[PDB]
């Protein structure tokens, strides 16, 4: 119901240092946003995560939303094997790397924002790690792990991976592993939240809470492709002044309708708001949960 | 002044320590059997360590017993009233006929009720014939029709979740303690399994039990009290019964959703020519959860309401005899502090003496570091061990005595040098 | 036509508060519909029992 998940709630700038070629048709991204950093994200058979919450953010987005910091170097090379801070991490993933693709872009450990980058016109490889050479190449990058992202300012720094009956799983080791063990490449839930580490987790307990706020409300430019428009400028219940604005029955119900008045007509998120997580038992509002095929190392002995 | 109730030994063969960095952590990973506490009493668990400071306790506190009972089969069910609607058409003008009328479907919808559309609602479409003439209001001979769209809806306001109890379960609401400070609450009945932050927990032997309760349902009211009907479940439904028309949920019920099953031929009609009266003579639900409503005299059980979660319980007056299955599931545990000195003093001594549950003590202990106090009498045969933290605080566990006047100096050693200390209370005849 | 159960019915009416009367009935459990709420019977009376042969 109501196809309005191309619209990029609040800024949603997809942009990276390297990535110039996008530039121009990246900030921001609207129904006609051209770039295969986006494109990918709403393919069928692929990301399921980020189509059971298309109204939400992403990692790029995230970043420029002053939410997610960035790495030191933001965009590794893969070309010279002189060693870069990037493949201590990546050599213990495991993520497929689609065909013409020169970066990739992840979650780090440090909660920052990491991503590597190959040289014109040199390509990436089948799992990502090193490069190769050279259909036509793409402008942008591919989001390597499942993750998504939102508005959140919650503290959580102090804390640390709880999982009992594993060893050393995803990056961080709680303890060695010498004697009996197997070990595989299975999946791990994890939170990353303002200025901590990657906490592994469990189970995953997430809950969407809905409420009547501005980033759950797309609104596009009304005429005789449909352009975005900022939802911000509309006004409050029971006002008529400023910006103009009208929408169909969530829209109207929560703020006003000018009907002849109005300029560009809103609609409501299908599925958005404040969503949860059930982290050491306590409920808090994490950033960005993503998923990552990695090295899971258990305990036999 | 209620205390610990069940103190054993812990076995060092599933009891690991490891020194890493000056700091020595535990290491729990076993399957352990404790005794199940009294009513309002705890069940601490002393251990021991590699060293000779490390002193962690697992007490277990018991809220008090419950007899809940197992659901398996359940259905939402409620009165409902439907409303009859009329419309006599005469022969040969649009679907008037006379073999449209009596082989009618009850699933189709005519054309002189098709304004209203695809109603996801429950609903029935029956044809009775009619006379016709001009004696009637018609212009021929031939006999005319009665379209017929009658459709169920609610007159209540609330619902009702008829449900029945296979076996009874015996649950008791425990209060776990972790051993870095958490407090989590659970429920463990017959044989059934909580996953906590240490492991998990379960019920092992049992022994109140009450055999055949088939013959007998409840009814759950959300936000109102329960009930019980002296009939067993009602599995098919049909007329003359309690459990005519049924949903699945509360929203199937109070909207009257055409999900739920009920009974061929309910609605009785009664055409009188352009006059129509739907009405059903289903039993109202309401009057029987009035009738026979909580508390209700059963054998020799009082039955009634719960007080933490949701579902039926019952009240009984014997004694509490099980057994509790304590399992480590690979824990984690430190121990960062030491053994320091502190001063004790005595606060009430109750209970009872050559009984199960023992004499609860009540000790004033008043420390400035994080340890463990230890005690123990003069003979050596009775030993007492209780945490030191920062502050005043009140401990206390099972005292067994042979005496209803006890009075015996107690020798409590906080990191080494024995002190003085001299208990006494008074106690009662009980088992 | 045949009786297969006596259904204990009662002629009764309805005095609203402005003054309007409507005639009813109720029969068994039934419950009909008025200008204000729902009538209904809690308990029925006697019960003649044994009317298939007639």
Same mark, same amino acid.
């Not at chain 2, 002296?230 to 005519?244: A, N, T, V, Y």
């Not at chain 2, 028309?245 to 009974?263: D, F, K, P, T």
């Given at each position: ?5 191309? $619209?990029?709630?609040?800024? #949603? ?197 809905? $409420? ?25 219940? #029971? ?30 998120? $299908? ?31 | 002044?209620?205390?610990?109730? =069940? ?116 609903? =029935?479409?029956?044809?009775? =014939? ?75 032997? &049992? ?69 129509? =009266? ?138 080494? &040098? ?14």
């Amino acid at each position: 119901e109501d196809p309005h998940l191309r $619209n990029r709630p609040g800024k #949603g700038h997809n942009y990276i240092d390297g990535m110039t070629q996008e530039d121009a048709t990246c900030k921001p991204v609207t129904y006609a946003g051209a770039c295969s950093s986006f494109d990918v994200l709403l393919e069928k058979g692929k990301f399921p995560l980020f189509q059971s919450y298309a109204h939400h953010r992403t990692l790029l987005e995230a970043v420029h939303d002053t939410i997610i910091a960035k790495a030191d170097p933001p965009s590794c090379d893969l070309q010279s094997a002189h060693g870069n801070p990037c493949m201590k991490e990546k050599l213990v993933m495991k993520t497929h790397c689609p065909n013409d693709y020169q970066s990739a872009h992840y979650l780090n450990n440090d909660g920052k924002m990491a991503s590597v980058k190959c040289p014109p016109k040199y390509e990436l490889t089948e799992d990502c790690n090193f490069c190769r050479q050279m259909a036509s190449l793409k402008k942008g990058s591919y989001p390597l792990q499942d993750l998504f992202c939102q508005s959140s300012e919650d503290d959580g720094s102090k804390l640390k991976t709880k999982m009992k009956g594993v060893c050393e799983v995803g990056v961080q080791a709680l303890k060695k592993c010498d004697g009996q063990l197997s070990t595989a490449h299975e999946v791990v839930p994890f939170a990353v939240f303002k200025n901590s580490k990657k906490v592994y987790l469990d189970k995953l307990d997430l809950k969407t809470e809905e $409420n009547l706020l501005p980033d759950s409300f797309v609104c596009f430019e009304h005429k005789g492709e449909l352009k975005s428009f900022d939802i911000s400028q509309c006004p409050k219940i #029971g006002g008529h002044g400023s910006k103009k604005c009208t929408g169909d029955a969530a829209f109207c119900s929560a703020y006003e309708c000018t009907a002849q008045y109005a300029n560009a007509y809103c609609s409501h998120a $299908n599925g958005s708001g404040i969503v949860q997580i059930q982290v050491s038992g306590v409920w808090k509002k994490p950033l960005c949960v993503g998923y990552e095929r990695v090295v899971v190392k258990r305990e036999l002995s | 002044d209620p205390g610990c109730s =069940e103190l054993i030994q812990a076995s060092s063969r599933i009891t690991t320590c490891s020194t890493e960095g000056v700091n020595t952590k535990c290491r729990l990973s076993g399957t352990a059997l404790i005794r199940a506490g009294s009513v309002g009493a705890e069940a601490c668990l002393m251990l021991k360590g590699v060293k000779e400071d490390q002193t962690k306790f697992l007490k277990i506190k018991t809220v008090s017993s419950e007899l809940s009972c197992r659901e398996g089969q359940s259905y939402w069910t409620g009165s409902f009233s439907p409303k009859c609607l009329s419309s006599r058409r005469c022969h040969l003008v649009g679907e008037c006929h006379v073999n449209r009328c009596l082989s009618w479907r009850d699933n189709e919808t005519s054309a002189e009720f098709s304004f209203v559309g695809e109603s996801t609602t429950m609903r =029935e479409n029956k044809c009775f =014939e009619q006379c016709g003439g001009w004696g009637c209001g018609c212009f021929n001979v031939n006999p005319s029709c009665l379209f017929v769209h009658t459709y169920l809806q609610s007159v209540r306001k609330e619902a009702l979740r008829v449900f029945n109890c296979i076996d009874w379960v015996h649950k008791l609401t425990l209060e776990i303690t972790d051993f870095d400070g958490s407090v989590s609450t659970i429920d463990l009945g017959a044989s059934s399994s909580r996953f906590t932050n240490w492991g998990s927990v379960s019920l092992s032997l &049992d022994a109140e039990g009450i055999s055949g309760s088939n013959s007998f349902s409840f009814i759950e009211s959300p936000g109102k009290g329960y009930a019980i009907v002296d009939e067993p479940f009602s599995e098919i439904p049909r007329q003359g019964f309690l459990g005519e028309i049924r949903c699945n949920s509360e929203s199937s019920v109070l909207s009257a959703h055409e999900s739920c099953l009920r009974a061929p031929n309910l609605i009785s009609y009664k055409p009188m020519i352009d006059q129509l =009266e739907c009405t059903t003579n289903l039993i109202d639900p309401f009057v029987v959860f009035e009738r026979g409503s909580l508390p209700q005299t059963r054998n020799d059980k009082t039955f009634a309401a719960s007080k933490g979660n949701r579902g039926v319980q019952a009240f009984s007056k014997g004694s509490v005899q099980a057994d509790l299955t304590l399992m480590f599931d690979n824990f984690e545990v430190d121990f960062v502090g030491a053994a320091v000195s502190c001063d004790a003093a005595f606060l009430n001594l109750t209970g009872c003496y050559s009984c199960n549950a023992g004499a609860r003590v009540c000790l004033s202990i008043t420390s400035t570091g994080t340890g463990s106090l230890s005690a123990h009498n003069k003979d050596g045969s009775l030993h007492i061990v209780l945490p030191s933290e920062n502050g005043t605080k009140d401990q206390c566990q099972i005292l067994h005595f042979t005496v209803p006047e006890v009075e015996e100096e107690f020798m409590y050693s906080c990191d080494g &040098d024995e002190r003085p200390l001299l208990v006494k209370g008074t106690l009662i005849a009980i088992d």
